[PDB]
């Protein structure tokens, strides 16, 4: 819901961690696209140590280039998704907001470059691209091209040239305590299978009455029987 979105050549990367991510609010301007690569979009009960939201403004016909193993103007030189992407390319038309006539030159894309982008590499540099033997001398000229070129959005164009805002969520998993657990409700007072982040068991879960100190995440009785457990998502004993 930010007022303005980053150009495709300087995409942002708002790291998200240590919160509860409700993925339902994202469902909603009509989401002409909501794809996911690696995880099933339909109904959020996994825990990731980091969520990276890369947000930008790409034209409509190039929303199809935000996809693993795809090539063209956007995926090669501006924003390169890896071959094993795990996340969800969300997009939606924004012809009302991002298509003024005072803000023609707010959205630029990288038309020239010497090699494809290493996955998740951002280049803001604006070095005059040299496409000839003679040196450019730092001033644009014949066979010396300035890379960034402007979309110059207009409100009267098609639905294939209108600013489709885009957000790419990548979910990442290290050997560190995962904290982005976004709410599964589980029944109490009745025999029920429980799977607490791989802690699998069967039993009756009840409102605990023992005082775990804040550094304790389990509970053992005599003879090492698991007597109490805390939820790694909502922290309930």
């Amino acid at each position, epitope marked *: 819901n930010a007022t303005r979105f980053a150009s495709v050549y300087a995409w942002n990367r708002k790291r998200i961690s240590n919160c509860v991510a409700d993925y339902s609010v994202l469902y909603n301007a009509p989401f002409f696209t909501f794809k996911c690569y690696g995880v099933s979009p339909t109904k959020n009960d996994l825990c990731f140590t980091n969520v990276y939201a890369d947000s930008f403004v790409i034209r409509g016909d190039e929303v199809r280039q935000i996809a693993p193993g795809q090539t063209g*103007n956007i995926a090669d030189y501006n924003y390169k998704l890896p071959d094993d992407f795990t996340g969800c390319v969300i997009a939606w038309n924004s012809n009302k907001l991002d298509s003024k006539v005072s803000g023609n030159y707010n959205y630029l894309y990288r038309l020239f470059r010497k090699s494809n982008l290493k996955p998740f590499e951002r280049d803001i540099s604006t070095e005059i691209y040299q496409a000839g*033997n003679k040196p450019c001398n730092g001033v644009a000229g014949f066979n010396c091209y300035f890379p960034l070129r402007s979309y110059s959005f207009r409100p009267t164009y098609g639905v*294939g040239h209108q600013p489709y805002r885009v957000v790419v969520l990548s979910f990442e998993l290290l050997h560190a305590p995962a904290t982005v657990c976004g709410p599964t409700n589980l029944v109490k007072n009745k025999c029920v299978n429980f799977n607490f982040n791989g802690l699998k068991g069967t039993g009756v879960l009840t409102e605990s009455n023992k005082k775990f100190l804040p550094f304790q995440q389990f509970g053992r009785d005599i003879a090492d029987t698991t007597d109490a457990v805390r939820d790694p998502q909502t922290l309930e004993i």
Partner: antibody
Amino acid sequence: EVQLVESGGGLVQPGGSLRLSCEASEIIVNRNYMNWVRQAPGKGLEWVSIIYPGGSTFYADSVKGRFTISRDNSKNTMYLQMNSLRAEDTAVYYCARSYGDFYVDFWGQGTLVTVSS
Amino acid sequence: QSVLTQPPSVSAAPGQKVTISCSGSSSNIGNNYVSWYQQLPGTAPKLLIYDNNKRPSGIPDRFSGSKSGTSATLGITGLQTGDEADYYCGTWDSSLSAWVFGGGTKLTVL
């Protein structure tokens, strides 16, 4: 002076194989987006293939799979590997530099190609 | 099916402005940029107009290019003898992911 000169054109039998080549001077083929376009006698330029700075290739519908475009490492020259020809590949292939995807700035002279016995 | 349509021929006498219209489906010419090329006999296409209106590198003047909706228009004030060539219109059809060219007009001076 800027110039692109192409060779490799002559008579060939159906199903043959050729290596047409595009030689670039004053310009550097390993950077500017280069394109192979064709025009059968009495016909219209038809896009055959475009090579991007980053190595990516695009080919037309009729010319898919059989063909291949390639960019030399050091010779400053590009090549089309034409394979599995038919009657509709009679042409005067041209190689042309295309700023981005917008317009084709420089055109080579022309290299006839014939598919007959 | 997108391939821009162009009249088979256009003819005018010298001193009379010549208009050429390239029309195509709004998949490629309504969302991308036209460009206009000139092919003199027995030669190679020479870029004439680019980016929907511009005139590059000092092309002989009075050559004009415009874009109206899903159509593009080329204009030459008068019909000079030297201008006789074939004229083509090209756009990057993203649906086909391919450059698409027009039929080509045989400009003949009356």
